[PDB]
Amino acid sequence: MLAKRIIACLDVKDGRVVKGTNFENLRDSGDPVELGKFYSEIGIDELVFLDITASVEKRKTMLELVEKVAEQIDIPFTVGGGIHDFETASELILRGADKVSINTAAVENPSLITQIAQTFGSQAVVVAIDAKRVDGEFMVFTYSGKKNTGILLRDWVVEVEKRGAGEILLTSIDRDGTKSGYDTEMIRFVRPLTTLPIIASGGAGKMEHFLEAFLAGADAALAASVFHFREIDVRELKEYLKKHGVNVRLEG
Amino acid sequence: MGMRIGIISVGPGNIMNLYRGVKRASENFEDVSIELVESPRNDLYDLLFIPGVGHFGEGMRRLRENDLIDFVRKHVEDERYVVGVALGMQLLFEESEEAPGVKGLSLIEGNVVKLRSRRLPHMGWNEVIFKDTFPNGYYYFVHTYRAVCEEEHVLGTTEYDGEIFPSAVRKGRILGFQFHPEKSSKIGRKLLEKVIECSLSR
Ligand SMILES: NC(=O)c1ncn([C@@H]2O[C@H](COP(=O)(O)O)[C@@H](O)[C@H]2O)c1/N=C/N[C@@H]1O[C@H](COP(=O)(O)O)[C@@H](O)[C@H]1O
Ligand SMILES: NC(=O)CC[C@H](N)C(=O)O
């Protein structure tokens, strides 16, 4: 039976993990390759490298990171942040990324989803969706959670499946970084609309929150803050989830 | 006495992931070399991997154009280990619904059919139960099609969405793995080490 996945998201800037971490056991805690290896070692199921960098030098630095990571990592990883066209997505997948995560450029050109899927398969395409309640409606936001597109979440989720996406990374802009819990209402809202796997994102602060996301229908739960500051231990979390009936990958 | 491992590198898909996983599995061995194989102009390897991610038809096409089909057969006939990974495992059989009318390597009797789930591909970590030799646990999968073979050739089984299918197969010294051990963290490394050991010890 398929495992419900625990995913770590690493914010990277200029080929380095932003802030560094609290893992003084590492030789370098801002090195994406060493940190990804550490997460594989402790039981993380997949990695997302999110490039929040703002250089003019950004395409090359992301390519350097994918090549560095693909050299040493032994679990699947997704790269995202500023992937604006097929050409950028292609170089990243060819350099070794298992998936690319696209958001703003997918909204502004939905055929980009199909373009990537047609060359690399639907499994290489993650569409990141940032959503927010506006006047009692779930709306899609682009430009780092910033621009209300006027597009309804239910319309976009369906369109994203038709265009050939392999997976949805669903972030509630209200919960991002608050450690208050995932937006389980939004997850429940999206679950019957699509048969695609849903990655819950934004708000995780405690072990109970990962359980809530799976009860709400997510196939995976992603977190950044709670891992970066070492507030939740991956193995303890997986043990907690298994005692509560969740099928997780927990090896001896 | 040195051990030569070959990895067919014509594709489709990212074959360098398996190359790096195999040399990771090889670090504690000395005198083990790993080579990328794109032509039959080589001496036979002790252990030959057939990787790939893509369409069954494109997998066979690239094996055909680079004159590797008889090279693979020479390994089977000389009782060297041949290991298919992911698409490479499917190429071991006779045909697939993914590529109607395309002939596979036909090294193991059976065929390849679409999984039954309403959600395809089968993608994520799923449990593999082995009859022997390899470690039970969760490996990483990404595939839409599955093998159908006789029970004697089933080496490991996995259940996805109610359907039990062969996630690993064995016929003599031909092995196939439907998952990606090079993307399966610690247990994938122990599986690849065990494959190397199987060919070092007969
Ligand atoms: N930190 C940033 O400055 C930033 N900049 C851009 N992003 C997002 O990345 C994506 C950019 O994609 P493109 O439009 O470039 O394709 C969009 O989702 C942006 O909103 C950013 N988001 C970062 N972290 C978010 O918060 C979640 C973690 O939550 P936590 O467990 O509670 O800590 C992550 O999954 C992300 O959704
Ligand atoms: N993802 C893959 O390409 C695996 C091999 C084959 N195309 C399948 O879907 O089963």
Numbering used by the authors:
A (entry chain A): 1 to 252
B (entry chain B): -1 to 200
Copy out sentences from the published article reporting this entry, exactly as the authors wrote them.
The imidazole glycerol phosphate synthase from Thermotoga maritima forms a heterodimeric bienzyme complex consisting of the two subunits HisF and HisH (HisFH). The HisFH complex catalyzes the synthesis of the histidine precursor imidazole glycerol phosphate (ImGP) and the purine precursor 5-aminoimidazole-4-carboxamide ribonucleotide (AICAR) from N′-[(5′-phosphoribulosyl) formimino]-5-aminoimidazole-4-carboxamide ribonucleotide (PrFAR) and glutamine (Gln)9,10. This reaction takes place in two main steps and starts with the hydrolysis of Gln to glutamate (Glu) and ammonia in the glutaminase subunit HisH. The ammonia then migrates over 25 Å from the HisH active site through a central tunnel across the beta-strand barrel of HisF to the HisF cyclase active site at the opposite face of the barrel.
In order to visualize the structural changes that take place upon formation of the active conformation, we determined the crystal structure of HisFH in the presence of ProFAR and Gln. We used the inactive hC84A mutant for crystallization, which shows identical CSPs to the hC84S mutant and solved the structure of the complex to a resolution of 2.06 Å. The asymmetric unit contains three HisFH complexes, all of which show electron density for Gln. Two of the complexes (chains A/B and C/D) adopt a conformation highly similar to previously published apo structures of the HisFH complex. In one of these HisFH complexes in the inactive conformation (chains A/B) the HisF active site shows unambiguous electron density for a ProFAR molecule. In contrast, the third HisFH complex (chains E/F) in our crystal shows electron density for both ligands and large, long range conformational changes that extend between both active sites. First, the β1α1 loop (fL1) in HisF moves by 25 Å from a position close to helix fα1 to a state, in which it covers the HisF active site (red arrow). In the closed state fL1 forms a short beta sheet and several highly conserved residues in the loop make extensive contacts with ProFAR and the HisF active site residues: fK19 forms a salt bridge with fD176 and the phosphate of ProFAR, the aromatic side chain of fF23 forms a π-stacking interaction with the imidazole ring of ProFAR and fN22 forms hydrogen bonds to the backbone carbonyls of fI173/fD174/fD176. Third, the formation of the active conformation is accompanied by an inter-subunit reorientation of the complex, similar as described in a previously reported hyperactive HisFH variant containing an unnatural amino acid at the subunit interface. This can, e.g., be visualized through the angle between the Cα atoms of fF120, hW123, and hG52 which is reduced from 25° in the inactive conformation to 10° in the active conformation. As a result, the amide group of the substrate Gln in the active site rotates into the newly formed oxyanion hole and forms hydrogen bonds with hV51/hL85 (through its amide carbonyl group) and hH178/hV140 (through its amide NH2 group).
